Design a protein around this ligand. Structure first.
Ligand code: HEM
Length: 456
């Protein structure tokens, strides 16, 4: 039994002077490099335990001992995401109901039914870049976000945000993005009740009404027509929990739809953006991935089967998730008193945070050269030690979207590689902005079309 390592405390401020950054995850990674696989972190009225090694994370992933904790970020997002799957406690009846109903709609098989709609949006991005003039460039995370938002709207509830037809997004997207920003801003608000935030609160209420009005109207519209689509909304309307026999109610369906948008859009666009970053920074890797794309994508548009063939592309995506997992942490609490790693007692209710980018740099698992981009690390996924790679979280609370995110990213990145050569025309210096997610801010490229016809 051992005292938990902890960075220096500064009287009443505790450890907080060490995080005076807008990139706390990257600052926490530097604390972990100094203090090792576990450290306690304290701030006024807050205590948590950050884990970074696979040995201890293997323990924290034991679901009989630890469950998902709702961080404060997730609590503020629950004000519009409600008791959707992301923002609900594992014990809530609606979490378990929605999980059992939605799981089959997110399986690897279910991907065959979404493929045509994902291709629809992916063709639109390819055509946008084909139609650029010679002087222009691409804003990478901005277009990736247009793409992921549109794909989740189409596959999620057969709704077109039409993000490629716009400079300013659809009013729902504007509201959702501003609501997420406000939720994150509230994390660092000293005097939340101060008059200067009256306008913030009013706007937050307006943005939630915009989101709810839209989604409720689409739900009511669909129930009236009886139209059956290939979308998740049809599955929610027709699904019954195998355990209770009950369906989701209309209000819970609204929260799942908002949740899929929130949970899916930034995380998946970050992944595509970092993968393209790594590829333009490693032209030899980019060449091997484009060669696979040209070998495999032999039809004017990709089939479901062809996407499954893009093995190297899949490896590039995993190695981007290893270095910069776009949802960089998840939070747990001890379900009962327990001892972690034989050494550190925990009391029931104690919080742990898994620091996924630091887990992914555990040199005992990956070798000494953990900063290098090498997709070949993933050539044999069965050989990777259990719990070493956790970009989609853990257990029954893992990413329900993982097969959807991966199928979409593979498809898109494979089409990009087939149709364009890319140029890092500004010699872009990586700048990782943190919201609740990671992205390469300001990342721009030029693409030069290979002049290959689309379909079809
Ligand atoms: C590369 C893309 C993505 C990454 C890295 C990612 C990562 C994660 C992580 C780490 C969790 C666990 C959160 C926690 O424990 O607090 C999570 C949960 C979740 N994600 Fe994703 N995600 C991605 C894409 C998506 C997509 C495309 C969707 C939906 C279409 C989605 C929907 C969800 C949902 C609904 C949950 C809550 C699941 C549950 O608790 O039952 N995610 N994701």
């Amino acid at each position: 039994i051992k005292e938990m390592p902890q960075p220096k405390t500064f009287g009443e401020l505790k450890n907080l002077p060490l995080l005076n950054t807008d990139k706390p995850v990257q600052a926490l990674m530097k604390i972990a490099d100094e203090l090792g696989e576990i450290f306690k972190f304290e701030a006024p009225g807050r205590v948590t335990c950050y884990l970074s090694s696979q040995r201890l994370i293997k323990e924290a992933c034991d679901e009989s001992r630890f469950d998902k904790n709702l961080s404060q970020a997730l609590k503020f997002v629950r004000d519009f995401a409600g008791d959707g799957l992301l923002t609900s406690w594992t014990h809530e009846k609606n979490w378990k109901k929605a999980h059992n109903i939605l799981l089959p709609s997110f399986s690897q098989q279910a991907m065959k039914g979404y493929h045509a709609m994902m291709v629809d949006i992916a063709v639109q991005l390819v055509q946008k870049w084909e139609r650029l003039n010679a002087d222009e460039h691409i804003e990478v995370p901005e277009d990736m976000t247009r793409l992921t938002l549109d794909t989740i709207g189409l596959c999620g509830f057969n709704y077109r945000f039409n993000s490629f037809y716009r400079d300013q997004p659809h009013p729902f997207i504007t509201s959702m993005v501003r609501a997420l920003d406000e939720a994150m801003n509230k994390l660092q608000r000293a005097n939340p009740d101060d008059p200067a935030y009256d306008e913030n609160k009013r706007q937050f209420q307006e943005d939630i009404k915009v989101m709810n009005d839209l989604v409720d109207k689409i739900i009511a519209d669909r129930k009236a027509s009886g139209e059956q689509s290939d979308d998740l909304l049809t599955h929610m309307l027709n699904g019954k929990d195998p355990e209770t026999g009950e369906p989701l109610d209309d209000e819970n369906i609204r929260y799942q739809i908002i949740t899929f948008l929130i949970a899916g859009h930034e995380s998946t666009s970050g992944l595509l953006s970092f993968a393209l970053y790594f590829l333009v920074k490693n032209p030899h890797v980019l060449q091997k991935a484009a060669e696979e794309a040209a070998r495999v994508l032999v039809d004017p548009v990709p089939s479901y089967k062809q996407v499954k063939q893009l093995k190297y592309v899949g490896m590039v995506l995993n190695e981007a998730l290893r270095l910069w997992p776009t949802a960089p942490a998840f939070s747990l609490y001890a379900k009962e008193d327990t001892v972690l790693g034989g050494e550190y007692p925990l009391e029931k209710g104690d919080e742990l945070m898994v620091l996924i980018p630091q887990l992914h740099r555990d040199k005992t698992i990956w070798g000494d050269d953990v900063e290098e981009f090498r997709p070949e690390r993933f050539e044999n996924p069965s050989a990777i030690p259990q719990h070493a790679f956790k970009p989609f979280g853990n257990g029954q609370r893992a990413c329900i979207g993982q097969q959807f995110a991966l199928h979409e990213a593979t498809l898109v990145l494979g089409m990009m590689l087939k149709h364009f050569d890319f140029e890092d025309h500004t010699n872009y210096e990586l700048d990782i902005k943190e919201t609740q997610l990671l992205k390469p801010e300001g990342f721009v490229v030029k693409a030069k079309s290979k002049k290959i016809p689309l379909g079809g």
